[PDB]
Structure 1
Amino acid sequence: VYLRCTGGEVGATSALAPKIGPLGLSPKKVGDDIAKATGDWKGLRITVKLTIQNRQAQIEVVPSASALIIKALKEPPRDRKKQKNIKHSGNITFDEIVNIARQMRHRSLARELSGTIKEILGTAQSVGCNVDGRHPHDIIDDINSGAVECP
């Protein structure tokens, strides 16, 4: 099982990861092509890819990461063609999608059952951090929900 946390375009410009792989020599172009097929429409930014190798090919699992899907919950798409307007727009509410996101986040947080994970993923950002009409200092103090409905 190989793990890699990179993504811009697909690549294939005579530059790739494989280093552990060429002991068995299974990826040279087919792994990159199936990585392109698993990276079709998801997405246009850095993702996490782990490939399970069992004697013929690679199974490409995409485990979603927290800050990466917070960046994916921005306004899409921004890849090229007149970028940089400017760096940190991020005008979202995220009142339920981050909730479903840490519902999917299992066995990788060392967490209490939705205790202060709202504070974690509300203060672990640098672009958004709140609905545009309130304050994250009020997020830290004024959340009194989720801890009953989520467990």
Structure 2
Amino acid sequence: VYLRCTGGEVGATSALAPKIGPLGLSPKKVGDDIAKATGDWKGLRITVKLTIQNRQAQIEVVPSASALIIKALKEPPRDRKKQKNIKHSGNITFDEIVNIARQMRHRSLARELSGTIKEILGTAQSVGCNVDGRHPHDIIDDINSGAVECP
């Protein structure tokens, strides 16, 4: 299992990860091309990739990182071609989507059962951080729901 946290386009501009790979010799271009097909349509932004090899294969699993999918919950798509107005627009509500996100957060948080993870993912963001009519500093002391319904 190989891990890599990079993504813009696919690349292949005479630059890649391989170092552990050429001891098993299965990718030199075919794995990078299959990574394109497994990273099609989701998305145009930085992801976390881990590849499983059994002597001839590349199994591309994308473990959804928390801040990466929070950035992916912006307005899509923005990769190039009239970027930079400027970097941090971020006008989103995320009423239940971050709730489904920490439902997907399995065995990576060392967590309490959705008690303070609302505070964690409310204050761990940088661009959005609330519905447009309140404050996340109030969310620190706001509604404590979900902690009964998740277990």
Query: When the two structures are superposed, what TM-score results if normalisation uses the length of structure 2?
Result: 0.98
In 1, Cα distance between equivalents of 2:24 and 2:111:
38
Hey, which bits of structure 1, 4+ residues long, moved more than 3 A? none
2:135 match: 135
Structure 2: unaligned runs, 5 residues or longer: none
Deviations 1:74-101 (A, max 9, x none): 0001111111111111100101000000
Deviations 1:109-128 (A, max 9, x none): 00000010000001001100
Deviations 1:45-94 (A, max 9, x none): 10011000001111111110000000000000111111111111110010
Deviations 1:2-59 (A, max 9, x none): 0011100000111000100001111101100110001100110100110000011111
How do 1:65-104 and structure 2 match up within 5 A? 65-104=65-104
Q: How many residues align?
A: 151
Deviation at 1:143, TM superposition (A): 2.1
In 2, Cα distance between equivalents of 1:139 and 1:133:
12
Structure 1: unaligned runs, 5 residues or longer: none
2:11 match: 11
In 2, Cα distance between equivalents of 1:81 and 1:93:
26
In 2, Cα distance between equivalents of 1:111 and 1:37:
34
Partner of 2:141, secondary structure, is: helix
RMSD of equivalent CA atoms? 0.6
1:150 match: 150
Partner of 2:115, secondary structure, is: coil
Partner of 1:95, secondary structure, is: coil
Q: Percent identity of the aligned residues?
A: 100
